[PDB]
Structure formats: C-alpha cells, structure tokens
Automatic annotation (TrEMBL), chain A:
Residues of the Activator of Hsp90 ATPase AHSA1-like N-terminal domain: 7-145
Part of the full-length chain shown: 15 to 160 of 349
Lineage of the organism: Eukaryota, Sar, Alveolata, Apicomplexa, Aconoidasida
Protein name: PFC0270w protein
Highest taxon of the lineage: Eukaryota
Annotated source species: Plasmodium falciparum (malaria parasite P. falciparum)
Family, as annotated: Belongs to the AHA1 family.
UniProtKB/TrEMBL annotation, chain B:
Residues of the full protein shown: 15 to 159 of 349
UniProt similarity note: Belongs to the AHA1 family.
TM region(s), chain numbering: none
Organism: Plasmodium falciparum
Activator of Hsp90 ATPase AHSA1-like N-terminal domain mapped to chain residues: 12-137
Listed name of the protein: PFC0270w protein
Highest taxon of source: Eukaryota
C-alpha cells in the first residue's frame, strides 16, 4: 500500500551515491594521500510525499577499505577497513554516527597513519563527504516525481 | 490518489475541440468513388493525462452524419466511438430510403465498403490524439 500511497524505493541510487562519494574522497596531506575502495553498502532509502512535504527514511551499513599513497614516491598501499554501522535519517541529523577504522596489521607505519590522520581528520572528512546525503536523496526524489508526472 | 500525485499531477488535458474537428474534417472529406458524407454532428469528450510515467487517454463520442450519392441518401450514426473502440475497430455503425436505388447501393456498397472506409478514415484517431498531445508538449521546448 505504501507504493500506491506514493512511497518510492531509492536503494539503487543510494548505494551508487554512497559508493561514488567515498570512492572519490581523497585526504590530501603533504607526503600522503588517503583514499577508499571496495565499498559494500547495505540498507534502504525511501521517500514519500505527505501534504506537500517530503518524508524520508534511510539506514545503511557502509563497509569499505582504506588505502594510502606515499605521494612523493608513487606507491599505493592497503591500510585496512572502515565500518559505518549506522548511517541513517536519525544519525545524520545529529552527525553523530560511529566510524570504526581498523588497521590490516600491527605495523608501525599504519599506526602512525591511523593516529596522525585517520582517527580524527579522516573521520571528519568521511562525515563531510556524506553530509549531503539526505538533501541529495530529496532532489533525486523530486526527479522521480518529474519522471512519473511531467515527462511525456 | 497519493500525496505525490496531489502535489505534482499536471492535470487532465481536454481535447474536445481537436477531437470534434478531426472526426468532422476526416469524415467530411471521405468519398467513395460517388458517395459523400455531410451534416456532421460530433458529441462527446476526449482527455489525455500523464500518470504512472505514461500518456493515458480516454474518449467517448456519438457521431452522426448523413450520406449523399451524386441527392440526399440518408443518415449514419456511430453510437459509441470510445477509448478502446480502435483496438479492433469493432464498434457499430448504423446506416439508414425506401426506393430500389437507395437499397441496391446500401447493399452493394455502404453495408461493407462504406463501413470499412468510414472505419479506415477514423482508425488512427487515438494514435493521432496521443501525437497531438505530445506535440502540444513539444510546443513549449524551443521557446
């Protein structure tokens, strides 16, 4: 009945958005670039219209990997995993969701990268990357409205 | 029915003038060669909407006219020219006259060839309605 009442499922769009944004996110330092790959995005996204207003609900687990380039030396390395277990309408509003970052091994190089860049700035930049999700979801929803009711 | 449709629905476009003019113009210009058609009355409604991502149409018409051979020959009615009539072109046409002249022509021409020609004339009505509505939208795209 929700579909007949105008709710639309945007899981494919949301998966694509989250993948695109994080796979293009680069954290640029003096001698290092942090980047991301291998994005699993699992969950749901939908919007309906109630009395002229968009009502949205989304929730995602985003699990991916982080890597780094020794910028001045032209070598890329695997770093570890990143898990955002609860990226949702509720957790986005307060921008307070967890980002759990792990290192692939116990080496000194990765500890330095994690401590110096990832644990604070890296998390900050990931959140900045994702912060417009709800606004972009709503714009996507508007074009679905166009597709169904305005395009001949 | 949904909040989405209530906000964004662009309305039920009415094409009464276009539909009446199309039926009238096409039937008035139809000859069987000589049998002609005159005195056209076209009564009804036609509409096109965009819903569910597609053009949706409906129409419902009575069409009345007279036929002449050249002399007044009589009258014709198409009682129900409607939305799904042109899928199979299997709507009724009533053709009506007591002389032997009018009888033979009715039996030898109007009954089969007359009705086939009338139906052929009108068979593209729905397709042409949809194309008219599309070009009515197109009108706004280069302005």
């Amino acid at each position: 009945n929700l579909y007949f009442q105008g709710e639309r499922n945007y899981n494919k769009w949301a998966e694509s958005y989250i993948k695109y944004n994080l796979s293009n996110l680069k954290i640029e330092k003096e001698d290092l670039t942090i980047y991301f790959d291998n994005l699993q995005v699992s969950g749901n996204a939908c919007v309906s219209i109630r009395k002229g207003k968009q009502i949205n609900s989304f929730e995602y687990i985003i699990k991916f990997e982080w890597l780094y380039s020794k910028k001045k030396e032209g070598k890329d390395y695997f770093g570890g995993s990143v898990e955002i277990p609860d990226f949702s309408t509720f957790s986005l509003e307060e921008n307070d969701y967890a980002i759990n970052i792990e290192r692939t091994d116990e080496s000194e190089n990765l500890r330095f990268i994690y401590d110096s860049i990832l644990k604070k700035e890296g998390k900050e930049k990931i959140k900045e990357c994702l912060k417009n999700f709800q606004e972009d979801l709503l714009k996507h929803d508007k074009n679905e409205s166009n597709k169904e009711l305005k395009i001949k």
